[PDB]
RNA sequence: GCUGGGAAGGCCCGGCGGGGAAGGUGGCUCGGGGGCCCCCGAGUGUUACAGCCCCCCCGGCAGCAGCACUCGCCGAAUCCCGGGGCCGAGGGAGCGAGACCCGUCGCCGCGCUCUCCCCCCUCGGGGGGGCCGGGCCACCCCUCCCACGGCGCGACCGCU
RNA sequence: UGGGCCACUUUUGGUAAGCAGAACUGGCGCUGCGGGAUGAACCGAACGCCGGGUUAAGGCGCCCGAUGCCGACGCUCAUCAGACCCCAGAAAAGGUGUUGGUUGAUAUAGACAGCAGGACGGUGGCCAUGGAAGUCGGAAUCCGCUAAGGAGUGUGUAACAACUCACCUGCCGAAUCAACUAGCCCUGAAAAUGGAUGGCGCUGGAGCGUCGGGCCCAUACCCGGCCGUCGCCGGCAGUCGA
RNA sequence: ACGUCGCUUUUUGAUCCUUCGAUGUCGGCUCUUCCUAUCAUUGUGAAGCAGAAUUCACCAAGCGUUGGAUUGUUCACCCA
RNA sequence: GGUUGGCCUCGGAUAGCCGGUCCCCCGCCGGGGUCCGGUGCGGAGUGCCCUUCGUCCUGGGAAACGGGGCGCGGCCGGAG
C-alpha cells in the first residue's frame, strides 16, 4: 500500500517474516519492523547459537576488516536476513532495502502507533507447540549485543505508559456505551438502518 | 503404477481358445487401479505369475468398476499384501477404517509410502476383507471402537494465513 | 499412533487445597504454599469434586513422547502436596577415613561451610536454595538435615553439598570421603 | 460375457521430439508419417501395424 | 478447559468446502481426520467430512452412532436445531456479514448518512457525559 | 446415452416375519456422585423406556450418475448464449447488359412476390395461420424373413 | 577429412582412475535455446524476423516468473538434521529414539515388574590336588521331602563361610514378554584461507515418502503476418469491351 | 589372530588432463596463517588408578613444542 | 518528482482469551477474589472514523452548557 506498514516482531519467525517483508519492499512499500528482539527462530537455542557462531567464524583471512560484517543487534540481524532475500547488488534491490527500517524495541515515532502482525509468520500457527525455539534477543546478547538490559528497561517503561493509555481508552469506551444507552430514543432510527444493512448486529 | 483415488475393478480374462482347449477357464481378479487401462495391465501382470497366461495369448472378457455396496457405513478393512523393501520381500497385514474398499486401499498405498518408502510398483495387494470390530488387531483402528467416542479439537491452527496477510489481531487457537 | 485420550487423576487430602490458574498449580497446605507452572506441557488440568478434591490431567491426541508427561505432572503435583503437608527432609552423612569433615551452619541455615574435607585448607561455601534450611542433627555425630517444602530445591541443595565434597586426581574407589545423602524422608513423619 | 470386436482403428500422436532418435524408431515414425512432435495420423489396426506401434 | 467435543450428535458448522455455510450432525467418527456427517434438514446428505472444515456448535442431538438418516432427522426436528441456531449470536453475525456484502451503492449511501447522524449525536452525548464526570469537587 | 439396463440412498411408523450380534439401549447388579428422590464408570445381554447388520412370502412411491454438489465414462447418445485477449494478410470475383455513379459478385443457407383467404397490433406500416394431395413412423389388428442370445425336444457325427 | 571425444548398455587389461582398449546407438566436435545455481556431452527441444495461445523438461517461501490451494495422508528433531538423474562425498557394524511389520511365548488355574518369604537331605556326590564343599577344571545330570529349590546363574573365600540367581510362595490385580525385520533419526564420520541443499533461510515444513487441483515459461507445438529458399519444369503471348 | 569394512592424500606408484613463443627445479634461513589424527598445559571419564608415576578415552588447536655435534640433505642419530 | 482520505499505541495467551461489576488492600485511582456477560473474536483491522457538488427560499428534527480563528497569552505532558 501507500502508507508505512509497521510490524511487531514479537512472536514472528525470522525467515518467514523476512520473506514477507522482502516481497513487500520490492513492491514499493515502506516497511518498519519494530521489536526485533522478540523475533523467534525455530530449533533449540543451542543449535541456533551454533549457527551464528559459525557465521562469526567466516571472516577474510587476509583482512578481516574487509570481510563479512557480523552485526550483533537483533534489528541488524533481521535486516541482514531481509538483505539475503533481496537483490541488494542492483539498484532495484538497494531501493527496496532503503524502504525497510528495523529497530530493537519500539522507538518514539512508532510506540504511539498501531502495529500489524503477519499470521503466516507467527510462531503460534507456523510451529508445532511441542517444538523448541530461540529468542533473537537472547541469541544476540550472547554473541555480542550490548543493549539487552537497557532495551529491557526502556520497553518496561514504554509498557507502563501504554497501560495508562489503554485504561483511558477503556474508560472512553465505557462512556461510549453509557451514552449510547442514554441517547436511545433518538438513535434507534439510524440504528435500524445499520442493523438492516448488516453493520452493528 | 501411479495413483489418485483408486477404484476397484473386476477383471475377468481367459486364454484364447486353441485346438487343445476349446473352452479355457475364466479367471477373475480384484484390481485397485486409477483407471481401467491400468486395471487391465495389472491383471495381465498377476495372471502371468499365477497361470501361464499372457496378454498376447489371452483376452479380457470383462472389466467393470466394482462400486462400494455400503459407502455410508463405517467399517474396518484388513489388507494382506507383500512388498519389496530395499533388502527383501515382506508380507504385511494392515488395518484401516473407511467407507469404501477402494478408499482403504488408497490409504494403504499412502501409508506404505509414508512409513516404508514403498512405491506402488513394489506393493502387491493380495487380499482385502471387511473385518468385524472385535477381530481388529491394530490399536490405532481399535481406539475408534467406542460407542461413546468423544474428543475435542485442541490446537486449531489458522489456515487462512494470507486472508488477510497483515492484521492487527493475533489469531486465536482455542475454540 | 496418537492416542485419543490419556488421563490420570491425583487425590488431594482434606487439609490441603489446590488452586489452578490455567496450567499453574498452586498447592496450599499447613506447611506453606507451593507454586509450579506446567506451561511447557500442553495438557488439560481440571478440579473434579468439592467432596474429595480430585485433580485430573488429560492429554488428547498425544504420541509416545507426550504421553509420558501425564504421569510426570501428576507426580510433581503429588510431591507438591507432600511438601506442603509433611515437608521434605534429606539426611546427609559425612564419611571420612582420616580427616574429620567440619560443617558449620551459617546464617539461618542458608550457608554451609565445609572446612577440613580430606585435610585441605580450602573452605567450601555452599549456599542452599531459597526455602531450604540446613542444620546439624543432634542424633548422629556427622549428619546434616536439609528441610524444605519443595523436593526439587531440597534435593538440589543436597546435591550441591555432595558435589562440593569431591575427590580429584585420586582413586575414588579408595578415597571415599565426602558427604552423601543417606536417606530421603519427610518431616512430621505421617 | 460379450467381448466386443478388437478395435480396427487407431489414432497415433507423436509425443517426443526429433532429437537423438534410434534408427529403427526413426524409420517407423517416417512410415507412420509422424515426422514432427504432436503430429497425428489414423492407423488401420492389424498385426503388421501393431508390431510397428510397439517399436515406437 | 474444553467445552465443545466431537461426539455423536454434535452439530457442526461447515466453514468451507462444497457445503460451506450449512449445519450438519456428526453421526460417526473415523480415523481421527474425518467423520461420517449428515444434515437431513439442512440439505447435506450423509458423507465423510474432514474435521478441518467443521466448527463445533453448542448443540448436541441424541441418537446412537450410525443410526439411519430417519432417526437423525427426527432428533433434528424435535430439538428444532434450525430455529435455535438462527437465534444464536453466531448465526446473526453470519447473517450480518451476508447482508453487508450484498449492500448496494444506494444502500451504502443511506448507511453513510444514518451512521453520520448516529455518530454525531452519540459523540455529543459523550462530550456531555465527560463534562458531567469532570464536575467533581470533594477532598 | 451407458452401467450390475448404475451402486448406495430418501419416503411409505414397510409390513407378516426369521436370524445374528456389539463400538450394548432400557432394565438389573456393583462401585463413585447431586436434596429414599436425579447423574458418572464397570459387568449382564438380545429390545425393553434406543439403535445396528443379513435374509425375506414380497415390496410400493419419488428421484435417478440428483437443482440435498456421495462415487463415473461419455455425446451422430449435443445444443444455445455471453465475456476477455491478439489479428484484418489479400485487392478487376461482371460469360451479363454489349457493362459506363457503381463488379453490394461466386459457392452455400434461407425470406417474399408473380395464388387466395382469414387473424392480431397499428395509419399505409408491422406480426402470424396457411391454402391441396402423397408416402414413412407413432396407436390397433395379424403378419413374412433374417440376425444375435437363451431354453427345451429330438435324428446324425465324433469322444467313453 | 584421415589426432577425436562423451553417455546408456555390452565389454577386455588394471586395485582403481576425469586410465587404456573394443561393440551398438545417440550426441559434442559443427549447436544456439528452456532446465540441471554454475558446466562441450545430462534432461527437454534443435534455430529465418515477429504477435497471440499452449506446452516439454523443470519448477511455483524470497532472491526469481509461478501454490497468497483454508491441498490430502503419514514419517522425522539432528549440540556435524535433510533437501531431486548425470553430480559433485561414504561403509561394515550398532541404538531400550520413534514408527510399522513377522514369528513365538506367558497370563484371573493370578502374567510382567516391583516389595516381601523359602531356595532343602543323601551329598563336603565321582575323578582330579597343595585346597578346591554348587561356582579353576574331566566326566557324569540322580533320588526323596516337596509349593519349590540346578548334586547349581553369578559375586566372593586358600578352602570354608556370607551374598545372588534359577525354581516356588505372599501383596498386587490385567494384560505382558522375547527374538527378528525395515523406514526416518542418531553413533560410526578426522585436514589444512572463511564458506556453501546456489543463497537467505526453512522444523503445523520451504525436510522425507505417496498423491490431487491450479499455475509459470523455450527459438518446441498451434494460428496469423513478413523475408528468403525449394517445389508445382504451376499459370500469363487471349491487351480477345466482344 | 583368522577374516572383513573404511577414511587420508604429509609416502611411493598408476595415469598424462593443464603448462615446452619457460609457472625458476633440493635443502636451509626468515615469516605468517591454517588443520587435528592432542606431546604438554585447562576441565573431565576409565584402569590390572593405594600414593607417586603411568596407560586408555572425551570436550579441546587458546597457548607452547627449545639449544647443539655429524651430514647439502629432507630423513637419521646422539648430547643436553 | 512521488502520491491521489485517516486510524492517536494495552500487555499478551494460544490445552485458552476479552469485557463489565460488588467486597479486600495500596494514596479519590489501580491490583486481586466473587458475580455477570461475550468467544468461530461484533468493545470485531473480514474492523472503526471521516466522507467533497456549491449555494437560495424554506419547515421539522440534532444541537443550542455549540462551532471557526496559519488571532493572542499562559500552563501541562512527552528524552529511546
Ligand atoms: Mg515415584
Ligand atoms: Mg595417582
Ligand atoms: Mg533427449
Ligand atoms: Mg445429469
Ligand atoms: Mg487489406
Ligand atoms: Mg576411453
Ligand atoms: Mg576440430
Ligand atoms: Mg551434424
Ligand atoms: Mg544441441
Ligand atoms: Mg541452460
Ligand atoms: Mg547442480
Ligand atoms: Mg511465444
Ligand atoms: Mg528455481
Ligand atoms: Mg513471485
Ligand atoms: Mg548422517
Ligand atoms: Mg597432455
Ligand atoms: Mg588419452
Ligand atoms: Mg617467467
Ligand atoms: Mg612466478
Ligand atoms: Mg579430537
From Swiss-Prot, chain A:
GO terms of molecular function: mRNA binding; RNA binding; structural constituent of ribosome
Any Pfam family the entry gives: Ribosomal_L13
CDD domains membership: Ribosomal_L13
One record GO biological process: negative regulation of formation of translation preinitiation complex
GO CC, one annotated term: cytoplasm
Residue numbers bearing the Phosphoserine modification: 75
Keyword Acetylation annotated: yes
PANTHER family recorded: LARGE RIBOSOMAL SUBUNIT PROTEIN UL13, RIBOSOMAL PROTEIN L13
Subunit structure: Component of the 60S ribosome. Component of the GAIT complex. Interacts with EIF4G1.
HAMAP family: Ribosomal_uL13 (MF_01366)
Family per similarity comment: Belongs to the universal ribosomal protein uL13 family.
UniProt-recorded name of the protein: Large ribosomal subunit protein uL13
Organism of origin: Homo sapiens (Human)
UniProtKB/Swiss-Prot annotation, chain B:
Modified residues (Phosphotyrosine): 62
Modified residues annotated as N6-succinyllysine in this record: 75
Sorted UniProt keywords: Cytoplasm, Isopeptide bond, Phosphoprotein, Ribonucleoprotein, Ribosomal protein, Ubl conjugation
Cellular localization per UniProt: Cytoplasm
Position(s), cross-link Glycyl lysine isopeptide (Lys-Gly) (interchain with G-Cter in SUMO2): 10, 127, 169
Keyword RNA-binding: no
Residues bearing the modification Phosphoserine: 70, 122
GO CC, any one term: cytosolic ribosome
Pfam families per record: Ribosomal_L18A
UniProt-recorded Gene Ontology molecular function terms: RNA binding; structural constituent of ribosome
GO biological process: cytoplasmic translation; translation
SUPFAM superfamilies named among the record's database cross-references: RplX-like
Keyword Ubl conjugation: yes
Tree of life domain: Eukaryota
Family of the protein in this entry: Belongs to the eukaryotic ribosomal protein eL20 family.
Assembly: Component of the large ribosomal subunit. Binds IPO9 with high affinity.
Annotated function: Component of the large ribosomal subunit. The ribosome is a large ribonucleoprotein complex responsible for the synthesis of proteins in the cell.
Protein name: Large ribosomal subunit protein eL20
Organism for this UniProt entry: Homo sapiens (Human)
Gene responsible for this protein: RPL18A
UniProtKB/Swiss-Prot annotation, chain C:
Any one Gene Ontology molecular-function term assigned to this protein's record: structural constituent of ribosome
One Pfam family of this chain: Ribosomal_L6
Entries under Gene3D superfamilies matching the protein: Ribosomal protein L6, alpha-beta domain (3.90.930.12)
TM annotation in the entry: none
Keyword Ribonucleoprotein assigned: yes
InterPro entries given in the database record: Ribosomal_uL6-like, Ribosomal_uL6-like_a/b-dom_sf, Ribosomal_uL6_a/b-dom, Ribosomal_uL6_CS2
Residues with the N6-acetyllysine modification: 121
Principal location: cytoplasm
Tagged with keyword Ribonucleoprotein: yes
Keywords assigned by UniProt, alphabetized: Acetylation, Cytoplasm, Ribonucleoprotein, Ribosomal protein
One cellular component term from this protein's GO annotations in UniProt: cytoplasm
Gene Ontology biological process: cytoplasmic translation; translation
Top-level taxon of origin: Eukaryota
Subcellular localization, as worded in the UniProt entry: Cytoplasm
Family: Belongs to the universal ribosomal protein uL6 family.
Job of this protein: Component of the large ribosomal subunit. The ribosome is a large ribonucleoprotein complex responsible for the synthesis of proteins in the cell.
Subunit structure: Component of the large ribosomal subunit.
Designated name of the protein: Large ribosomal subunit protein uL6
Taxonomic classification: Eukaryota, Metazoa, Chordata, Craniata, Vertebrata
Gene designation per UniProt: RPL9
Swiss-Prot record, chain E:
GO cellular component terms given for this protein: cytoplasm; cytosol; cytosolic large ribosomal subunit; cytosolic ribosome; extracellular exosome; membrane; postsynaptic density
Origin species: Homo sapiens
One GO MF term attached to the UniProt entry: RNA binding
Modified residues (Phosphoserine): 138
Described purpose of this protein according to its UniProt entry: Component of the large ribosomal subunit. The ribosome is a large ribonucleoprotein complex responsible for the synthesis of proteins in the cell.
Family according to the record: Belongs to the eukaryotic ribosomal protein eL14 family.
Keywords of the record: Acetylation, Cytoplasm, Isopeptide bond, Phosphoprotein, Repeat, Ribonucleoprotein, Ribosomal protein, Ubl conjugation
Primary location: cytoplasm
Highest taxon in the source lineage: Eukaryota
Subunit: Component of the large ribosomal subunit.
Gene Ontology annotations of biological process type: cytoplasmic translation; ribosomal large subunit biogenesis; rRNA processing; translation
Protein name per its UniProtKB record: Large ribosomal subunit protein eL14
Cross-linked sites for Glycyl lysine isopeptide (Lys-Gly) (interchain with G-Cter in SUMO2): 123
Modified residues annotated as N6-succinyllysine in this record: 84
Subcellular location: Cytoplasm
Residues annotated with N6-acetyllysine modification: 78, 84
